[PDB]
Amino acid sequence: KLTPTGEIEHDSVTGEAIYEPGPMAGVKYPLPDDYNAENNNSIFQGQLPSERRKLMSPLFDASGTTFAQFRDLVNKRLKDNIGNPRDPENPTQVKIDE
Amino acid sequence: MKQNINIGNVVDDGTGDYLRKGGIKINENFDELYYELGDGDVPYSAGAWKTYNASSGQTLTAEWGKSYAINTSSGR
Amino acid sequence: MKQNINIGNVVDDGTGDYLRKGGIKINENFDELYYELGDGDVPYSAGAWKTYNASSGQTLTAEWGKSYAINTSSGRVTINLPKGTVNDYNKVIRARDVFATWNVNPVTLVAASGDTIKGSAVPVEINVRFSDLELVYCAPGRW
Amino acid sequence: MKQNINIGNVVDDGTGDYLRKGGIKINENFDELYYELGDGDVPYSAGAWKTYNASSGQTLTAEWGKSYAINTSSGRVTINLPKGTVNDYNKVIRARDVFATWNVNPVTLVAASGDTIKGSAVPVEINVRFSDLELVYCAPGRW
Amino acid sequence: DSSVIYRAIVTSKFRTEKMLNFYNSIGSGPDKNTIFITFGRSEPWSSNENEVGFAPPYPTDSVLGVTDMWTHMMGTVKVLPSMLDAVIPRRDWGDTRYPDPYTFRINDIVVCNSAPYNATESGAGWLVYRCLDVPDTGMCSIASLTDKDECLKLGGKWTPSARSMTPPEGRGDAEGTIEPGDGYVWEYLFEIPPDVSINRCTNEYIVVPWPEELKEDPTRWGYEDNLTWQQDDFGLIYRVKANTIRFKAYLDSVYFPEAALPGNKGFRQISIITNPLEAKAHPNDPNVKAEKDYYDPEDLMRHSGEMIYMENRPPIIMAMDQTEEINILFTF
Amino acid sequence: GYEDNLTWQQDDFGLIYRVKANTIRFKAYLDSVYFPEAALPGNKGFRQISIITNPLEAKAHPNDPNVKAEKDYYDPEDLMRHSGEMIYMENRPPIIMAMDQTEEINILFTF
């Protein structure tokens, strides 16, 4: 939706704004044919592969990343099954004693 | 005026950054300058061109200075 | 200094943007334009801002400009910093804020090696500029 | 110049922000940090500092200024650098940087086109007053 | 159900720390709680009180249940840290008045050396031993199995079918083995000086020292000698897995201003409150936290501090003899 | 935001009681930067995630005085194996713990 993290919430659930998928999937693009300033080995491996294997990285080309903090991955979250009224519905994990 | 953060570095993929923390720094850097000369500036080097344009009142008010005219037509 | 880099793709979704690499750029800007005034802090923009406080030591030193002692009553001063003589500083004296018998001396906050060891100063001169102090450190009433 | 927008903030995992629009704000922290200060910077902070070598023709201009050597024995030189209807320049010259007969000369690094072939600048003048500007090219010692 | 599942249990050592947290929480300055014992309730309830059974009014934790309490409070006593003590279940070796005198589970702390039927060393000391192993015979624990070791894997609690002759005799770990004779491998852990045992230890529980009194000498506690890979391992309150604490005070210490009432009519309900403020004449005064030693409950502000425990009991009239004792043993 | 409450001066400030909080959780940030070893392409971080209390430093050579351990993200070595007492236990079979992905552990007690 709009500019400023477009269409803040729906106001129905309040909180943070919705996210549309946008450009979906494909190659990771070749990178600027080097991508490695010194061609260094960075943390057990060279810079050209890995050294940034993360599927989620800020491009400056979108407002998805905001600032500071971190982005939380909500697809995988270990969910307390039994708890307060709120609860995460269908739970991800369960504690079963001996 | 030289007290500002370095704001992290690109070594390989690596780790230590602050990885978007640095705004609170990045701000101070800007926040150094735009407030270091902040209520004022240098008028002379940028206060030259404009008045080569018309004689109009050309407000320089309440900071720096503006219109040197550097050319003919009425001097403003 | 007219050399500065604007960091990468500026707009919207895209596959274009800078590799997180940018900050390296944005790293440099603050460097360069810090090397603008390496130590330097002029008063002149703020020149009369500071000293209004009582009996201010008002250290502008090593580089900075400071002071008025605007409303005076100040019995004011200014300060020095030690040697190293890279020829940078500024100082606002009694500046454009109307001076009075509060006066000051460059010796009257802390001398370090500076001020040339000369002492006191005269009453309200304010109009126009009273003093520039000196770059580096060692200096009398500044020429 | 007090014009720059602060790019918002962080907030942990995050809510609202740039959304990659930060530099498109942040780059503007550079403009009024350049095109207000863009070309002529302040030499006389770092503009006595570069002549510590000899009579060499080190040419500081096209922005600010450099060479007072801080020292005698420099046989100091100078250039005003080119022409062309700019209006932007200055320097510290000797000032607190003390040169005995080292002088400096607007010739000495080959002023060339403008300047009216007027010789140099003072020998040891060092303390107090200074060789200041060449507006565009042109100075006959415009101090 | 298909999801990640994690199986987690808090360790028993958590409790003993929590116990060690309640201790040290008693002190004069702020952030150190101060506990009081309260009695009160002079007026009898109903007429069936003084009979058998019949139960008291069951106490409630609401605001109404607190308000009346402060109206009936006869007297209070301040608990000093000295009169609080750690305690553990005591199994006297070879005593016939408690189950399994001659047999012992895999790890069970057992005091010996007190009373004649166990002798071991002299010079008293009330020695204590953990028992690291047992003879292997006799069917034990889950299902059937047969042999000890296999019964020790797959959990299990093995009970020796052979009486253990003689008490543990030594000063150092694993005193068994090293001889064709039977017995099993008790492990010395500390000692109880005779002076403390006549006071601080009842016959249900034996004291184990706070990791303080072990300083300002260890020797009194027979801990003066130990393996100690660490410089100290000083507090052994963790070694025993001491799960509980015990309070003791003489009713002559509690303060009754009236002094003829508690004797004539008993205190029917006891409650312990925390952090009372001193008497304030009007709400013109700053809040102060209660100190000194006695506090006639008139000097306590109403609802001044929070109360962790209420008891309601039949009259428990008290004689003025200089010995009768409070107990109130906490299980933390 | 107090001083609206006259019942405050009744029982000092504080109020964790009036809410009847009766539960405590603490959390911890596990950043693969602090443990660059371990965090390599393939680390599987299999179960075991404990808690503990009051550990101690390596001590250098064993004879010495001993210090309470105040510095964050101690490596397993330097801890005097089995220093302090283990206050909690858990087993979560994989987890992941890849580099650059921080880890946030929430554990909730009623004590």
Coordinates of C-alpha atoms in Angstrom, one line a residue, chain C:
Chain C
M1 CA 34.5 19.9 0.2
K2 CA 32.2 18.9 -2.7
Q3 CA 33.1 15.2 -2.7
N4 CA 30.3 13.1 -1.1
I5 CA 28.5 9.9 -2.1
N6 CA 24.7 9.5 -1.9
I7 CA 24.4 5.7 -1.2
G8 CA 22.8 3.5 -3.8
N9 CA 19.4 2.7 -5.1
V10 CA 17.1 5.5 -3.7
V11 CA 13.5 4.5 -4.2
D12 CA 11.5 1.3 -4.2
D13 CA 11.4 -2.5 -4.4
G14 CA 13.8 -3.3 -7.2
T15 CA 16.6 -5.8 -7.2
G16 CA 19.0 -2.7 -7.2
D17 CA 20.4 -1.3 -4.0
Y18 CA 23.8 -1.4 -2.3
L19 CA 24.8 -4.7 -0.8
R20 CA 24.7 -3.3 2.7
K21 CA 28.0 -2.1 1.3
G22 CA 26.8 1.4 1.4
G23 CA 27.6 2.2 5.0
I24 CA 31.2 2.1 3.9
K25 CA 30.3 5.0 1.8
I26 CA 28.2 6.7 4.5
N27 CA 31.2 5.8 6.7
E28 CA 33.4 8.1 4.5
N29 CA 31.1 11.1 4.4
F30 CA 31.2 11.7 8.2
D31 CA 35.0 11.1 7.9
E32 CA 35.6 13.7 5.2
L33 CA 33.3 16.3 6.6
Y34 CA 34.7 15.7 10.0
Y35 CA 38.1 16.3 8.5
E36 CA 36.4 19.5 7.4
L37 CA 37.2 21.1 10.8
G38 CA 39.6 18.6 12.1
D39 CA 39.7 20.1 15.5
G40 CA 37.9 23.3 14.5
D41 CA 34.8 24.7 16.1
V42 CA 34.1 28.3 15.2
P43 CA 32.2 30.4 17.7
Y44 CA 31.2 32.9 15.1
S45 CA 28.0 31.1 14.1
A46 CA 27.2 30.6 17.8
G47 CA 29.9 33.0 18.9
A48 CA 28.0 34.8 21.7
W49 CA 26.0 31.7 22.7
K50 CA 27.9 30.3 25.6
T51 CA 29.4 32.2 28.3
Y52 CA 26.3 33.8 29.8
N53 CA 26.8 31.5 32.8
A54 CA 28.4 32.7 35.9
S55 CA 32.2 33.2 36.1
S56 CA 32.5 30.7 33.3
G57 CA 35.7 29.0 32.8
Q58 CA 34.2 28.5 29.4
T59 CA 36.7 26.1 27.8
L60 CA 36.6 26.6 24.0
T61 CA 39.9 24.9 23.9
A62 CA 41.9 22.7 21.6
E63 CA 39.4 23.9 19.2
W64 CA 36.1 25.7 19.7
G65 CA 34.7 29.1 19.9
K66 CA 32.5 30.0 22.8
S67 CA 31.5 33.1 24.4
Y68 CA 29.8 36.3 25.1
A69 CA 29.3 36.9 28.7
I70 CA 26.4 38.6 27.2
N71 CA 24.5 40.1 30.1
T72 CA 27.9 40.2 31.8
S73 CA 27.9 40.2 35.6
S74 CA 30.1 37.4 34.5
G75 CA 33.6 38.2 35.7
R76 CA 34.0 35.8 32.9
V77 CA 37.0 34.0 31.4
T78 CA 38.1 31.7 28.6
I79 CA 40.4 28.8 28.5
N80 CA 43.4 27.5 26.6
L81 CA 44.4 23.8 26.0
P82 CA 48.0 22.6 25.8
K83 CA 50.5 22.5 23.0
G84 CA 50.5 20.6 19.7
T85 CA 50.3 23.8 17.6
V86 CA 48.4 22.5 14.5
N87 CA 47.2 26.1 14.0
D88 CA 43.5 25.7 14.6
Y89 CA 41.0 27.5 17.0
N90 CA 38.5 30.3 17.3
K91 CA 37.3 32.5 20.2
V92 CA 34.5 34.9 20.6
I93 CA 35.9 37.3 23.3
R94 CA 33.0 39.6 24.2
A95 CA 31.5 39.1 20.7
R96 CA 28.4 41.0 19.6
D97 CA 26.6 40.6 22.9
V98 CA 27.1 43.9 24.6
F99 CA 30.2 43.5 26.8
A100 CA 30.6 45.1 30.2
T101 CA 33.0 45.2 33.1
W102 CA 32.6 41.5 33.6
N103 CA 35.4 41.2 31.0
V104 CA 37.6 38.1 31.2
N105 CA 41.2 37.1 30.5
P106 CA 42.5 34.1 28.5
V107 CA 44.4 33.5 31.7
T108 CA 41.3 33.5 33.9
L109 CA 39.9 30.0 33.3
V110 CA 42.9 27.8 32.8
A111 CA 46.2 28.8 31.2
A112 CA 47.8 25.5 30.3
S113 CA 50.7 26.7 28.1
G114 CA 48.4 29.2 26.3
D115 CA 47.3 32.8 26.6
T116 CA 51.1 33.8 26.6
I117 CA 50.7 34.3 30.5
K118 CA 49.4 37.8 30.0
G119 CA 46.6 38.7 32.4
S120 CA 43.2 40.6 32.7
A121 CA 41.6 42.7 30.0
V122 CA 39.7 45.9 29.5
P123 CA 36.0 46.9 29.9
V124 CA 33.2 46.7 27.3
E125 CA 34.7 46.9 23.8
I126 CA 32.1 44.6 22.4
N127 CA 30.9 46.4 19.2
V128 CA 32.1 44.5 16.1
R129 CA 34.5 41.7 17.3
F130 CA 36.6 42.0 20.4
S131 CA 39.2 39.2 19.9
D132 CA 39.9 36.1 17.8
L133 CA 42.4 34.4 20.2
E134 CA 44.7 32.3 18.1
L135 CA 45.1 29.1 16.2
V136 CA 47.7 26.6 17.5
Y137 CA 48.1 27.6 21.2
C138 CA 50.9 30.0 22.1
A139 CA 49.7 33.6 21.7
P140 CA 49.1 37.0 23.3
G141 CA 46.0 39.2 22.7
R142 CA 46.1 37.8 19.1
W143 CA 47.1 40.7 16.8

